[PDB]
């Protein structure tokens, strides 16, 4: 929707040379603001955005207590899961959990999700009604019935319908100059001679936030999907993102090929040409 | 803020 808060947790096992490594990150929109790493030296929930740093020590002491227990929960999850499929103790596995809520323009609850993955594929997820479950395999329904008898979906719905949006609004207002901003793309176009008859036109879009963007190629006002190379959005590290789309063009008729950049900070889409 | 401590599978 308009805004969203998300968390990501990963626990990779290291059989024979240590306990499973736990990494937790938190994002609002496309901005990371918290992180944790069992291999890091701080051993605490660290800030990654300027606005989150103003929180009190009870906030950081609490978030540190959660990841220290969440890591322990994933440890018994890895040991239990290797028995669900009867896997050896030498194979290295990983666990991924994520959840979050999406809000609308009124900053009220619009959508919630909570998903769990084992070894890179889906395990079990909360449906869009936040009341049912979607188990992947036979062993996935073993934990579903274990979580249905414990009324897990009831207390998970509360995070997504309740404190997620109430603490997402708290983050949207405190960090207003960071999260509620919108940076229009800085666009330009390069020209590269491939052969005597063909040349590639590359349409650049830099320094834009959020990451959602659409790059379309048109010829005489008609979309052209053939002979087009589009690359996925790249994080610049400046807190902004980068993306470009190219097209190979017969030499001499680049006047007809038009690039089109659609973004949140652009009411009407931009149109890029070579000359 | 993060969620409650999760349930073990």
């Amino acid at each position: 929707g308009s805004h969203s808060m998300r968390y990501f947790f990963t626990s990779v096992s290291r059989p024979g040379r240590g306990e499973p490594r736990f990494i937790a990150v938190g994002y609002v929109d496309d901005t990371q603001f918290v992180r944790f790493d069992s291999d890091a030296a701080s051993q605490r929930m660290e800030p990654r955005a300027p606005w989150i740093e103003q929180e009190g020590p009870e906030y950081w002491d609490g978030e540190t207590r959660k990841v220290k227990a969440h890591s322990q929960t994933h440890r018994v999850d890895l040991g239990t899961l290797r028995g669900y499929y009867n896997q050896s103790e030498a194979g290295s596995h990983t666990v991924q959990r994520m959840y979050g809520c999406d809000v609308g323009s009124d900053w009220r609850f619009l959508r919630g999700y909570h998903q769990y993955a084992y070894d890179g594929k889906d395990y079990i997820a909360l449906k869009e009604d936040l009341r049912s479950w979607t188990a992947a395999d036979m062993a996935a329904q073993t934990t579903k019935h274990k979580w249905e008898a414990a009324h897990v979906a009831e207390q998970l719905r509360a995070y997504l319908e309740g404190t997620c949006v109430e603490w997402l609004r708290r983050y949207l207002e405190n960090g207003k100059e960071t999260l509620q901003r919108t940076d229009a793309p800085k666009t330009h176009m390069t020209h590269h001679a491939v052969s005597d008859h063909e040349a590639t036109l590359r349409c650049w879009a830099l320094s834009f936030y959020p990451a959602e963007i659409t790059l379309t190629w048109q010829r005489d006002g008609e979309d052209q999907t053939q002979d087009t190379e589009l690359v996925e959005t790249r994080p610049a590290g400046d807190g902004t993102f980068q993306k470009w789309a190219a097209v190979v063009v017969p030499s001499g008729q680049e006047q007809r090929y038009t690039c089109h950049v659609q973004h949140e900070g652009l009411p009407k889409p931009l149109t890029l040409r070579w000359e | 803020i993060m969620d409650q401590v999760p349930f073990s599978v």
Partner: T-cell receptor
Amino acid sequence: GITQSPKYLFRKEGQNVTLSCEQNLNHDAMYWYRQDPGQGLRLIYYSQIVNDFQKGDIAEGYSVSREKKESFPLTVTSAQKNPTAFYLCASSMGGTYEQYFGPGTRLTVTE
Amino acid sequence: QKEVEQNSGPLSVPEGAIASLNCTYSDRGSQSFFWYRQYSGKSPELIMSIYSNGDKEDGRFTAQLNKASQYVSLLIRDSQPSDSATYLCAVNALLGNQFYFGTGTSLTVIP
């Protein structure tokens, strides 16, 4: 499945006591409270992991050690100015989840 | 003040009438709300638990929760002599990963 021992305990002022608390629910967290007559509950010590215990509101004169997940032995010392109270041990799955109490131990220390 | 407040003063309700025990709290990312019953000399017994706004009925008592205004209540129907006890209010706290108890409200049904 939470048990405490004994139900009634009485000691002399100046020596140490060891109030035991066993947990059968396989809960990760355990809690220790004291209840004075007509003044509610007050947290003494609490733990959330096997070897991670943290001080409560009134930890003066109290010591605790969670060496394993099953037990939460709280030992009171002579440094406690008013040891006489109703000590309640609780345990729960998570720090933010509902707790369940044992039968409780009434300790009375006299001059 | 405390994270969870409730009128500790002894409230009286006639037998067969409806008892209304109120409880307010300070929002600490509070998400789960519970009611404990504790008879004189024994341990608090978990009797009620609500997680969303509205009413939740179970037995002769209902749990009413409002999160816009920080307060949770417990209505008891057909007040019996076995209902005379102090009822403790419990509110979790995601800010700090904590669990907080109120001082308790002593209920005495009068015949």
